[PDB]
């Protein structure tokens, strides 16, 4: 019943648009409604996740001032009971760091809408 | 059954189908003979004279792009004949004297057969202290194709294609001598 709240972190507004487009108000009709919180700066994302109340965080590994993998590592080291983290990786060879970030899932750029949706479903289920 | 003739290019023997051009045999053997007017899919014309090679029993250098293989021919390219190398380099020089100093702005730069073949088979510096031929550039021969006649080496590949391959001879070699230039009729 609660609208799942998803944090979308990316300096690039187009990556946020793509994430918010692959995912919709409902990932599937069986899932609850989805609410998106866009954040463009790592401090703001950290503050938001400090307030809690998030079911998933999508962090762009290509974020300019503070990459998504660093933010994922930070949040998993700083927020207790933090939501599962999905990281967007700018290249295949970033996969290793995606593992190091301990993000529950990694989706390479360019963001395949279906792959992102499937990963999000797997993390929420 | 296709008839195989055999001949020696430089000092390596090779067998190729009868009717093969020396340039094609050299290609199959791995010898890089410089060429501009030759085209595998166009009927040979022997215009640019760039593909000259020395053939035993012939006073003149022979354009490998027009020479059919013979069952006992002996061919030595610029790699194994000072005469052939000198001829090819002289042809390259004569090819470059009138050429514009346009490589930085030329679209073909970096992918230009003239640049590559001048590096591989040309002299390092010019002797042409005289005045270069010049044309207005670039003139349009159609809505899509621009023509910079100064860079033209008059290899006739454009015209030979538009005549043989496509039956659309709307471009042809106009004028005569140093003024010869590919062109459309007037405005057609």
């Amino acid at each position: 019943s609660a609208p799942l709240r998803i944090l979308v972190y990316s300096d690039n507004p187009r990556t946020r648009e793509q994430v918010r487009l692959a995912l919709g108000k409902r990932i599937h009709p069986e899932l609850p409604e989805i609410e998106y919180v866009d954040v463009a700066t790592a401090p703001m994302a950290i503050s938001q996740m400090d307030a809690g109340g998030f079911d998933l965080a999508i962090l762009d590994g290509e974020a300019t001032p503070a990459g998504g993998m660093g933010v994922a590592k930070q949040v998993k080291d700083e927020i207790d009971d933090c939501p599962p983290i999905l990281v967007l990786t700018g290249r295949a060879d970033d996969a290793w760091l995606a593992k190091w970030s301990r993000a529950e899932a990694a989706v390479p750029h360019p963001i395949d809408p279906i792959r992102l949706s499937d990963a999000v479903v797997s993390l929420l289920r | 059954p296709v008839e195989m003739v055999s001949l020696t290019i430089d000092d390596h023997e090779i067998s190729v189908p009868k009717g093969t051009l020396l340039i094609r045999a050299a290609e199959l053997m791995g010898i890089q003979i410089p060429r501009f007017c030759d085209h595998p899919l166009l009927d040979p014309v022997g215009a640019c004279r760039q593909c000259l090679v020395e053939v035993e029993g012939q006073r003149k250098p022979m354009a490998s792009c027009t020479t059919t293989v013979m069952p006992d021919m002996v061919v030595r390219t610029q790699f194994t004949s000072e005469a052939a190398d000198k001829a090819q380099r002289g042809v390259m020089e004569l090819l470059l004297i009138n050429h514009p100093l346009d490589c930085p702005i030329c679209d073909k730069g970096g992918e230009c057969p003239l640049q590559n073949q001048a590096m591989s088979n040309g002299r390092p510096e010019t002797r042409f202290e005289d005045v270069k031929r010049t044309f207005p550039k670039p003139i349009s021969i159609s809505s899509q194709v621009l023509l910079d006649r100064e860079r033209c080496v008059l290899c006739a590949r454009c015209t030979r294609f538009s005549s043989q391959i496509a039956g659309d001879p709307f471009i042809d070699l106009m004028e005569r001598g140093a003024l010869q230039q590919v062109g459309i009729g007037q405005d057609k």
Binding site: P65 | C103, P104, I105, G109, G110, K137, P138
Partner: protein
Amino acid sequence: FLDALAGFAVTLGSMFKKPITEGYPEKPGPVAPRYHGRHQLNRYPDGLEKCIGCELCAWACPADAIYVEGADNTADERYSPGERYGRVYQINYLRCIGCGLCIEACPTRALTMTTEYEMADDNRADLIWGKDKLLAPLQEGMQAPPHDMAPGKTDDDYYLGNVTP
């Protein structure tokens, strides 16, 4: 053996010598004349841009730190002699390694490397310096780039150096 204490003499003596530090930033030290500082896009004496947009500088860059796009010097709007000019010219100084292959590559001396070096920013994008930042300042006698070539002159004259304000 006092030799084992020689070090004490070195430090003590150097106490009474004037410190050798250069006084940057207030009194910056002298860089070498040949130092590989910021790239700079230069102009001809009449103000036309030298960059013909050949992309040789970008071609030779080992770090892909230069992005260049050429455009025609239409008679209505000419920026450089000849039929091409560099419409878009960007150097990603977060990829530039100061190797200097670009200036060695440039066939028009349009690209030089000045001795200026101060460069830093808190934003990655701000260090992608475009044509506006790299162009040399317009000096006395130079006109705005969008103007026709010098009277009675042509590209060859510019390259041979026969052009004046």
